[model samples]
Target chain A: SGFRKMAFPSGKVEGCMVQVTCGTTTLNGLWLDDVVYCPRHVICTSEDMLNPNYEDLLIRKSNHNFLVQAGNVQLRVIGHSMQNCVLKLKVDTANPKTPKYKFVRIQPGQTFSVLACYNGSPSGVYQCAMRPNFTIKGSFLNGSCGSVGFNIDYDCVSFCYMHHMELPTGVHAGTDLEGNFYGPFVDRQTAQAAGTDTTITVNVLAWLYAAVINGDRWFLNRFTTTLNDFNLVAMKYNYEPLTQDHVDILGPLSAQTGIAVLDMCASLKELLQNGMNGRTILGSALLEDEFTPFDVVRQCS
Target chain B: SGFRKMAFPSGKVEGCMVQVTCGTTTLNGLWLDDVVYCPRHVICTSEDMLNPNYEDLLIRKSNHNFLVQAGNVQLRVIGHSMQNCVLKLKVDTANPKTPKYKFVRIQPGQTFSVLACYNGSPSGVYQCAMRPNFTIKGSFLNGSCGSVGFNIDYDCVSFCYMHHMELPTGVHAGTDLEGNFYGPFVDRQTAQAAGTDTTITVNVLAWLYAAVINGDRWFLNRFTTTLNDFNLVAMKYNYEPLTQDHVDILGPLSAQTGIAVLDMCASLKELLQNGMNGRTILGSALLEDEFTPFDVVRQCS
Candidate 1:
């Protein structure tokens, strides 16, 4: 019934239409290449249709919230198949510090211009991954037809977040000293018993402050992974080595000691690896213990 | 008698300067291995110093605004030698919409932190070149240091600009289809008389709007190089192939034709190169005339 808005290199933000394929219609329904043309008020079907084909093309499935077709394609009815050309900007970073959602809707074949930067990249195009359903067709360096506008399919905030999450910038349990990375949370003590030395008290306040207040993605990811990896790993100390949601989030490595670690930053990874090899590291200011062990590393910035 | 404000790993914003060296002072000077520490009000110098070294370590040079040593060292005086670890923050992108200058001063051993991203590269640390006098010392992933603060020695706005300028992302004349680029402004006609076919009136407004208004660095750089390459090539058509300012700006090459070209963008370089050879291509709209030969091209973003 509706088309997705698309941006054209010709500086237009208008509705774009695609021929719908595989639908049972009644009278004079135009078809080409197995695609049915629907233009509102012109070549549009008048009567209501029975259930339309599956969302994909032909299954006739009914579980999904898909569109339904009129039993017959009546003549002279207006169709709402074509959509406007628009920048589906879900979240934006034009204000960098205050990234949020905004949509730039438009019409197909019409004209428009806008400015957008991808993940804050100076090039406004690369250094970040593109959204799955979105793409940059082409760009114009000259304003031959109109003012130069950018083509954005999503917000840079989300782009920046997703790109960081998906990038294989570091190995398991080791974060890059140069870029951002996740931090690991240990049990501080063996499951044998809860002693003063067995305490695993995390500095939850610092992590929250950095992530929630400072907008530090490093802190956010680190803290998030700490909670995520710790809960799941502990649950899976009884958990999934891979497959679960936390698997991708942590990018963890399974150690020989049947432990979940090295899914942390560099120094921490080394300390953890050393601990696994029978060494006690000293950095955090422990409260006489982690069964009273404290994660007091100065991990804010 | 000044310590530059430095941003300490601790939470603070103040001066951070280095010890001055190589200057003739009067009696009682507290010297520590060719390095003089001055803290106004603490271990500070007393008398005025002779003309300082050539801003380096020795020799007096008047061309530069270098510091001078006191003729005599004043004892029991406060010094202003060690500076605080301050974030130089010249042009920030916090409000990326309007990037400009700001300074966040700090102390050295006093400790501090702040928020910053490098060239908008999600991670805020890599994907862009570091500024000349700027560096990212380290970062904290936790808020142990009172609300994780970033150490932005320079403003991201300038960081982004300078990084783009210095990056060797592309070749001398050809631009990447995926990133921003500089465009060449060419003269429409040969030295031959101007004809209706030789007209090259460019659409200057589009480019200005895109570059100047839209902040399309591509158009600005392209237009800048065009003016530079044209005048210089037209002038260096008599100018420097390398040594001049435009050399770094344009990243041009001295062509086999004994002409200065390829110092332009991909498309224009090809056109100009083809022209030098024997190909007359067409893209721009010709006016009734240019110079009787115009340097018209839609060289805008």
Candidate 2:
């Protein structure tokens, strides 16, 4: 079937909607069986994916440098190219007053490390970039020294963006321009005007429903991983793994949904009948075997 | 028998020195029996010791509701006083940019709780205080509505404070405000100039030497406490107690310095011959059985 233009709200166009449309168009499909079933196929392409020369600077162990050792938050850096460069880093925490900085010189593949005594289990962002002048010089003259490459003009790419990883709340944490909290529909107008505030984008019911279908596998994985870590910690303390009764709460959904077509048909029926509670049921089913609300982060900065 | 005004550096006058000088004058002895043997009798008095009106506010273990459950940093609050009050809190990380806040109201003995999904071993400062109007109202009414007291002027007090429990520089992680790396001595002057910046204060040779004789027992107590904590951590991790070769290192000093006379006498001789090494020898001996360059923080704000 060919595409048909419908008067869908322009403000509603975002996240998985944008992703699904562009993605389906590329695949030559004009219709989605259900809105909830579509978005799982489209992964938002990061800017790094668009850049021809990304990952020229690498944190060894794929950003694993942000680990805690001897009560200090530790970071290690390496230059991947044949350019002698100064690596500039900005380390930020929860308050806007205290930020730590590091200016490290690294030759091709050479390593440098920084350490600070941060209290407790540390959480924050580590942003790193090759200082422009060094990047510029390295690009100039391609002979063994390299040439003036276009990649030198890149903006500061965040090496590690650590944040508080949270699960979806029944009410999305979003606000309007006048600084008032608003629902997803009202928030859509604000996002349209601001052009980049995405807080409200995913909270829209359809998108979240879609995300629960597709976007939540990773979240589930993270939850399971956190449980494993907790188990290890408990074992270290000579205690048993944390166990609970909620594991069986979603087993019925999982059993009914496992047969492909029957899952979508049955899930859609439940979703329509129960509304938000139905959505919670479907999402809960994703982790039917492990139902503890564990505080595990999907990523480390 | 009387005091001698030795040319001690004016900039170097600090915590224990102030205590010891005033203390020795009271004890009727100015001459240190031995440079290494002197400091143990002086205990620095903190303001908490002088103030009678401290610990008026207490958080009950029932309020241990701050435990992480279902992947959220949970806080529970109860008003112990009769007056109705609002509790305000700021949670911060090492970065200055990601503070999270919570505000809750509770009547006398009433309770409230808040939750958020923060990841990993949670590390940050939680600062709480009553708003000014609340403080003022409490102070104004002696009828137990609580008086609105002006001494309630509040500052951001971190619930956790992390620091390096470093012995000395067999290693150097140095820096200067002028954008250069400097030696420990230059760094000391900077610490002195910064007035209250005592980061480098306890590591000087004379201080360490003096500390070895008079300066060590308290330090020894802290070292022992740290060891006890490490053992607990090891036990929690299901690992054997941490062991080290440094225990016998202090045995010589301990054997020579016994009771009152032996302490100052034997330590003085060891310090003179060994110099700064003597300080390390004595310090190492304090943790004679357990030695590791473990970075332990006294607090976790």
Candidate 3:
């Protein structure tokens, strides 16, 4: 037929610049053009950042501590739609151009879904808040501290709630004496927002929920072994049996959990036995039990 | 200073199909409507093809066999421009819907400045020719026998005379027995056209001119040894020569024969050295001894 002509952005379209500022330091965008660079200056931290009253503390979790470094750091963030969030940043430079303080902002929800962009590299410490906003955090050693060999308080509780269920709501919506199940069920802040009066009754329900989520399954299974094997098998799965010198205690306990456990095991068994795609050596239906520490919470509530 | 954009031919242009008879195959241009479907066809070789007859023949050099094969039958060729020439080509398909052949008509006395081009995978063969006319003087095998091989003879003598020296006029511009140089160095053909009765000497001058060009040490030194060495060194800090050992010997010998080798060594050298920047390296600086094969008819009577 005919021809298609190609067009391109002209070479002369290089954009102007703008500078940003924090505290006393000034920073400029990539180039020196007036539009983006002029008038605006970047401000960064100096010796007198935050008032001395507040300390950069680490909140504790299983192993490491999540920390808030000592300094006055404000993140200039901008999100475009959900996916296209971009950030242009200026950090307190090390006296001049080199990066001094380090910072990382993680999304409260699925960290992978959100983009974590930063213009400068942070120094000093590495911390991740394992329990979201809880005081439990990581600690960066001061000047002489090497990157490793730091101490952590694993047993310390940073927040009032000890478990996922301690939200002052019943385990499941229907499990509460008031017969509420859905959630807003677990979190009081959520229940209050939904207009619940949040009575003492709600608090007890929340405690019960917390017990269900956090109470040691080994103690519970032994305490309730006469009641049902479901809880026993669960305990066996969560914590290793101290007397399991001969064999695994979970398999037998799981077998005794009855039809529900049997059914789940059978489904899994079928997948493996049938070899997924009918491969030989695995042609029958059988049951299996997968144990995960997190699944303990997932299974009950 | 502001930059200015320079323009040159992109070396790409739309080509149209020319209707012509290629032997008994009367379909589209030289090839069949579907070369794949109709593999066997006896056709008159059009332009830009490797003529089969002159397989290993060359006046000055015996270099790489300008032929190659892949699989059952795929041909490949490589060689230098043996002459100042033009190209005649059909777009590489047989369907009427296919693009037509684009003709690159090279004028006589003009050097075929090579542009960077792919020899094409497996390899592509090109026939070196003088005039764009249909007669196959010789050929270099490019692709396979599925395609025609057209090679044009190296008319070094005539080309040199026609392109450079002035034709003498008036009396017999021949040597007055003293072996002195002379020329009616205008257009010899034009003088013949004018019906000048004087005997045009095509002997003595041709030999002497042939001796100069064919015997000249500069071309061989500058083109063959120097540039060739440079190219090889650049290919790898070390050198690996591509041409046959004897190829160098013949360039000088061909010139003395008065029968121009027509081997566009200079053009080929440009193709190899300068890449797409087609430039002429040889000028009028050559001495009389440099004209041999090229000096033939040009410097003759």
Cα error, candidate 2, residue A252 (Å): 13
Docking class of 3: incorrect
The numbered model that scores best in DockQ is 1
lDDT of 3 at A296: 20
TM-score ranking, high to low: 1, 2, 3
- Model 1 chain B lDDT-worst window of ten: B286-295
Q: TM-scores of the first chain across all predictions? A: 0.14, 0.18, 0.18
Name the runs in model 2 displaced over 4 angstroms.
A1-269, A272-274, A277-301, B1-301
Best by TM-score: 1
lDDT of each: 0.20, 0.19, 0.21
- Model 2: lDDT of residue B7: 12
Q: Residue-wise lDDT of candidate 3 within A173-252, one digit each (tens)? A: 11111112223332222333222221111111122222223321211222222213322443433321122211132333
Clashes of 3: 80
* Candidate 1 per-residue lDDT over residues A1-301, each given as its tens digit: 0000111111011111111212232111112122222211111123422322212222222212112122222112222232111011111112112223222322111112121212111111111111111111122231111112223232321111111111111111111111122132111121222111111112122222222222222311232245444454434322212224323322211221122322332223232223213221111111111110011111221
| TM of chain B vs. native, candidate 2 | 0.17
Estimated TM-score for each candidate: 0.18, 0.16, 0.14
Which 10 residues in a row give candidate 2 chain B its minimum summed lDDT?
B140-149
